[PDB]
Amino acid sequence: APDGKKGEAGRPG
Amino acid sequence: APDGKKGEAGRPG
Amino acid sequence: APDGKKGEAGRPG
Amino acid sequence: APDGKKGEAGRPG
Amino acid sequence: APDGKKGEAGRPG
Amino acid sequence: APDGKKGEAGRPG
Amino acid sequence: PPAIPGIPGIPGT
Amino acid sequence: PPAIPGIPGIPGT
Amino acid sequence: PPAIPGIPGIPGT
Amino acid sequence: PPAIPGIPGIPGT
Amino acid sequence: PPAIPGIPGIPGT
Amino acid sequence: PPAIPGIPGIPGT
Amino acid sequence: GIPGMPGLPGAPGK
Amino acid sequence: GIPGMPGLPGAPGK
Amino acid sequence: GIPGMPGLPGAPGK
Amino acid sequence: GIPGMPGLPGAPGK
Amino acid sequence: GIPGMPGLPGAPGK
Amino acid sequence: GIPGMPGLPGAPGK
Fold first, then answer.
1. How far apart (Å, rounded) are the C-alpha atoms in residues G2 and F3?
2. Do the Cβ atoms of J9 and A10 come closer than 8 Å?
3. Rounded CA gap, N1 and G3, in Å?
4. Which residue of D has its CA nearest to H1?
5. CA–CA dist Q1, M7 (Å, integer)
């Protein structure tokens, strides 16, 4: 069961 | 037959 | 054969 | 039946 | 074998 | 097994 | 009866 | 019972 | 006759 | 055991 | 012969 | 051997 | 029975 | 019979 | 048993 | 015979 | 055995 | 034999 990658959150500024 | 949702149009400005 | 919708081009400015 | 995640709305400003 | 379309690169400025 | 292409990172500025 | 995907919305005026 | 996809979120006010 | 996906639109001039 | 897709990330503060 | 998806384009210089 | 999708790229520093 | 996908919302003007 | 996907709309200029 | 996709998050205002 | 998907176009510079 | 999709990364703030 | 999808490219900084 090859499962997907989880995305990154954006950065502050 | 579970069918998909239709998207919204953008707003003016 | 239910085929997909083609997208719109962007507008000039 | 593994069902999908619902997206977040954007923030005001 | 109906194969997909390749995307365009962005323009300079 | 035709596998997908990996995306590019963004550039600095 | 397999399902049909939904149409994406347009950018606003 | 095959699975159903999730709804995309809206742009904020 | 299985269906074919649609082409994405271009950015405007 | 068929695979499950990953969750998309959020916009940053 | 099942079909292969297309490659996404790059951001411009 | 069915195929595996590719990883999306990150925003740049 | 396979289910369908949903669409995206457009971008606001300026 | 499997159905197809639709495309996205381009971005406006400047 | 096929699994489903997840949605995208909206864009912030101005 | 299953068909394939198409790609997205890049964003313009500045 | 069908494989899964991956997610997208969020946008930066301002 | 089903084929796979490709990824998206990130956005530039500021």
1. 27
2. yes
3. 10
4. D1
5. 27
Q: Which residues are CB-neighbours of N12 under 8 A, at least 6 positions away? A: C10, C11, C12, C13, G11, I11, I12
- J4 contacts in O (CB within 8 Å)? 3
User: Nearest CA of chain C to the CA of G10: how many Å?
Assistant: 8
Picking from L10, K1, Q5, D12, the residue whose alpha carbon sits closest to that of residue A11 is L10
* Residue J2: count of CB within 10 angstroms of its CB: 14
Asked if residue Q6 lies in contact with residue A7, where contact means CB atoms within 8 angstroms, the answer is yes
Resolution in A: 3.7
Q: What is the DSSP letter of H13?
A: -
One-letter amino acid for residue B1 of the chain? A
**Chains in contact with G via at least 3 Cβ–Cβ pairs below 8 Å:** B, C, M, N
Compare CB distances from D11 to O7, O8, O12 and report the shortest one's residue: O12
- How far is residue J7's CA from residue H3's CA, in Å, rounded to a whole number? 16
Cross-chain residue pair R13–F7, CB shorter than 8 Å: no
Fill in the DSSP letter of residue H8: P
Q: If we measure between CA atoms, which residue out of B13, O10, C7, B7 comes closest to residue G12?
A: B13
Residue matched to tokens 């996907």? N5
Q: How far is CA E8 from the centre of its chain?
A: 3
Find, among H3, M6, R4, I6, the residue nearest to C1 by Cα.
I6
Distance CA K2, CA E12 (A): 37
Q: Contact, I5 vs K6, CB < 8 A?
A: no
